[PDB]
Structure 1
Amino acid sequence: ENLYFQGDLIVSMRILGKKRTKTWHKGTLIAIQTVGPGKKYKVKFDNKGKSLLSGNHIAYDYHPPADKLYVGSRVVAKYKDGNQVWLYAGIVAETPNVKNKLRFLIFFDDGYASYVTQSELYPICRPLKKTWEDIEDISCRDFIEEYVTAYPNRPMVLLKSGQLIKTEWEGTWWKSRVEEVDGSLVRILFLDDKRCEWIYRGSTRLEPMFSMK
């Protein structure tokens, strides 16, 4: 069945859609449909390519108002590396507070964690009732369910600058060093190659956390 609007969505609105690359891109909502229990949203991306998307695979082209997001909220966030930016789906792990210097903590669908500001976020239009249930990587899905279900119970390890620990990376444990702590994240330096990473302090990739998981 055809629809020309659906709640707060209207045909011809600007929107973000999830492309086949798993990154999100700006476009225009050109059609809406409802077929039995399922709604889909036809998006024309700015390159004129089109995709028929479920409501959890579109996001508003605006930033969340204050107090609209909560822990567990399904969002698209900017991920920055060098001079590049990607829009990528994730879950709000923390909302702005004194402890995190008024930032949102995002757990991206691929497992990376990052503090971001409101200008770096977009709410997903129609998240699943259990927001984690569209996380494609089942290990990430299971982690998010665990995290959100326990919250605010959050087992984390206390780490200090200079501390030497082993950190897991792709199936091996590596000699590493705590370079700095930022709220619920720690920046770990791998001593073998001097590559570093921001990791959640409740991650089982940190040896002390693994041991007590």
Structure 2
Amino acid sequence: ENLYFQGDLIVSMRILGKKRTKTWHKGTLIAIQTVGPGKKYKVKFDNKGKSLLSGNHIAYDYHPPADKLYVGSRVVAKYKGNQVWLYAGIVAETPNVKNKLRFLIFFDDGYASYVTQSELYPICRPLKKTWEDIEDISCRDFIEEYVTAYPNRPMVLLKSGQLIKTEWEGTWWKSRVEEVDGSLVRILFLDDKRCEWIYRGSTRLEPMFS
């Protein structure tokens, strides 16, 4: 059937849709379709191109209220070289004193960042197990364990200057802790002389792996 209304969604509304590139873009909801128990949402992107999307691949074009964001909530967030995209992830932390009132996001590709409320958008129809549409099995299983074990979160305590081994492309590299920010650590890879922010509970940090 063709619907005009479905839950709080209405045909003609502005919305965000996931493109094939895996980045999210503004568009208009032009149709809602049912096929038995299933629902699909037709989006016309601002470039005139159209996709027929599952409800976990559209997001509201507003910032979620804080009382609607939980650990494990499925969101689209602002993602950082010198460019900014909108990319899907999972809420890992909500605002508290220790994180300076920010949200910790674990993005689907394995990146992590702190963001503000104004950098988040809620996915319209998240899966019951919100991690189940994370493409990479290793990423997906990590999130399942993290979200379900929460608030039990083993983490390594690290200090600036500390020498550790950090994983990259499947092997261990000599690295140094450059700075710490809440549950994230900035690691300098010593051979390459570039940095990455990594979650302190990541098994990419050799002390966590052990």
Q: What CA distance in whole angstroms lies between the structure 1 residues aligned with 2:31 and 2:122?
A: 20
Shift of 1:65: 1.1
Q: How does 1:100-139 map to 2 (within 5 A)?
A: 100-139=99-138
Residue by residue over 1:91-134, the C-alpha shift from the partner in whole angstroms, topping out at 9 and shown as x without a partner, is 00001111100000000000111000011000000000000000
Residue identity over aligned pairs, in percent, reads: 100
Q: What CA distance in whole angstroms lies between the structure 2 residues aligned with 1:61 and 1:146?
A: 30
Q: What value does the CA root-mean-square deviation take over the aligned residues?
A: 0.6
The secondary structure found in structure 2 opposite 1:84 is coil
Any gaps of 5 or more consecutive residues in structure 2? none
Any gaps of 5 or more consecutive residues in structure 1? none
The secondary structure found in structure 2 opposite 1:141 is helix
- Aligned length, in residue pairs: 210
The secondary structure found in structure 1 opposite 2:90 is strand
Residue by residue over 1:51-83, the C-alpha shift from the partner in whole angstroms, topping out at 9 and shown as x without a partner, is 000000000000011221000000000002x43
Residue by residue over 1:122-150, the C-alpha shift from the partner in whole angstroms, topping out at 9 and shown as x without a partner, is 00000000000000111110000000110
Q: What CA distance in whole angstroms lies between the structure 2 residues aligned with 1:132 and 1:62?
A: 22
Q: What CA distance in whole angstroms lies between the structure 2 residues aligned with 1:138 and 1:3?
A: 34
| Pair 1:89 & 2:88 matched | yes
**Runs of 4+ deviating beyond 2 Å:** none
Shift of 1:33: 0.9
Q: Report the TM-score, using the length of structure 1 for normalisation.
A: 0.97
Q: What CA distance in whole angstroms lies between the structure 2 residues aligned with 1:179 and 1:37?
A: 51
The secondary structure found in structure 2 opposite 1:98 is coil
Q: What CA distance in whole angstroms lies between the structure 1 residues aligned with 2:39 and 2:87?
A: 22
